[model samples]
Target chain A: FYPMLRYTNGPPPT
Target chain B: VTEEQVHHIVKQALQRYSEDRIGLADYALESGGASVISTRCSETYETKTALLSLFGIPLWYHSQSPRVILQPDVHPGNCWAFQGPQGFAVVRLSARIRPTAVTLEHVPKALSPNSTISSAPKDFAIFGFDEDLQQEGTLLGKFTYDQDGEPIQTFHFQAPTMATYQVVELRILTNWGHPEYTCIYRFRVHGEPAH
Candidate 1:
């Protein structure tokens, strides 16, 4: 199975 | 190894996998330290999310869920810098996943004010690994970060077929105006882990 996006870190606005 | 032993080993790994979570630190230790070079920074270079912004316990600083905010710059407090044009860092995945895209974030500001050079990486290549953990030969792609304003840049791999990869190697060729020290806030992978 392929994983969906796992986003970490921040840009607050973007 | 015998099948019985394999089951025992997998059971232990799953216990850790459930607790440790997946990312840089887990990858570093699981991959046998081949994922990153701690010596890249003389100061403390963290392999955990401590250097990374908005990942753990919710911060009271904002109303939005901390998980949603993408980091703008390398937090002034945490980042890693490596010496010379050949400086680089790598992040290996515990699973043989198909990498779709990579987002490279740059450290905020230049190494020096008067100096035009920055600790940010300029030219770099992304290479994937085969089953043996050896380089898969041709790079996923070579990307250039000649100009800065965009703190985080994401690039996608053009592989027509999805191939399972264990490791993704980052080779930094140079940096923006910096005579030495190529720095990066983080390298984020956007893809699915293969089951």
Candidate 2:
């Protein structure tokens, strides 16, 4: 499993 | 005295000590007059179109823009994250200065997930550009961020430059262990401005 969620698109994660 | 009072007292003392050690004001703070000109790479967000999931789900998220580094805040979840281990940010200072040192800060491990600041920057280099970004400016210093040390770390240049620079660049070379991105909480440039 991935450690953290990866962003797909939109604005980026802060 | 209460816990809050003790915290405040300690904080104030540390601030004074830091000021004495640096011997100059931070020129890279937005409130002080600095601004980010450009960033090499930063994580962007977009809406998730497909629901297909293999083992993990992907979705749209908010951005951790590079501008956050200019702010004095060093709280968790508020930072700048760029893709991969390598990235850079170019900033224009408020005044020309002969840089002497820099400070890099990251969220405390207690405030991070799994008690780890894995996304914090590691090896990095500082460069100074006099006027234009056309040339490969002078290398001011190279330093490393130790995860085991304090959350806020300051590294001084071995040989302080006599040349003043209005523009500076931070080149991140590596990070702890974050596979997808690296996060920078706060970056400060300390120097003696021309009188």
Candidate 3:
């Protein structure tokens, strides 16, 4: 099935 | 690292097969969709286009041959996408090749150039742990590079539905020339292994 899920792996690293 | 390879669109002229920039769309793998300017952007484009059109229909595009419909280009094969699956594996095919060249500094012969030429090498990478399983600690293996050769065929499997994280999806591939690769796309396909 094709579904769209939004996510951010982690905060922008330094 | 899995949010790239979504906007690497190419002018119909370049990816037209016979165009000089034809190699711009031969990406076999990718990591992020936004790393367009990173190593080897052209081949990166090829890969996205291929992924978009995978298991899709045929479409007419650019002045060139009607572009395939796997990668859905709104007007001229521009965008691409894919759905998640249950109990599937991540397979990576790679290779390395070198071009033929002649040098004048050493032998001054018509065909004397050795080493250092247009090259394409396939790489083998992985999500280590029982490859048949998903999201295990990724293994750091020795990536073999060849000169003047075709890309290699490398495979890695992500089994055990638990390891296959759907929310975090990305691909890194050296599908183009210049020892480069990128992420193809990020998709959340609602597929689960047989419970």
Best by lDDT: 2
Which segments of model 1 are wrong by more than 4 Å? Answer: A1-14, B1-73, B109-117, B132-138
Residue ranges of candidate 2 with Cα displaced over 4 Å: A1-14, B1-24, B39-61
Which of the two candidates, 2 or 3, achieves a greater TM-score against the reference? 2
Tens digits of per-residue lDDT, candidate 2, B101-149, equal 9988888888876888788899999999987564788999989999999
lDDT of 3 by residue, B89-173 (tens): 2321111111011010111112324433222222423232333234454443323333333211222233322333211112323
TM-score of candidate 2 versus the correct structure, residues matched by position: 0.76
Per-residue lDDT for B6-109 in model 1, tens only? 99999988876665223222221322222332232123222234232366755433111111112233454334555566753444444456677666765444
DockQ of 3: 0.04
- Rank all candidate structures by their DockQ, best first, as comma-separated numbers: 2, 3, 1
Worst 10 residues of 1 chain B by lDDT: B62-71
In model 2, residue pairs whose N, Cα or C atoms come closer than 3 Å (at least 3 residues apart or on different chains), thus clashing, are A9-B45, A9-B46, A10-B45, A10-B46, A11-B45, A12-B62, A12-B63, A13-B62
How well docked is model 1, in DockQ terms? 0.02
lDDT measured at residue B108 in model 3 versus the true structure, 0 to 100: 15
Pitting candidate 1 against candidate 3, the one with the higher TM-score is 1
TM-scores for all candidates: the values are 0.53, 0.76, 0.21
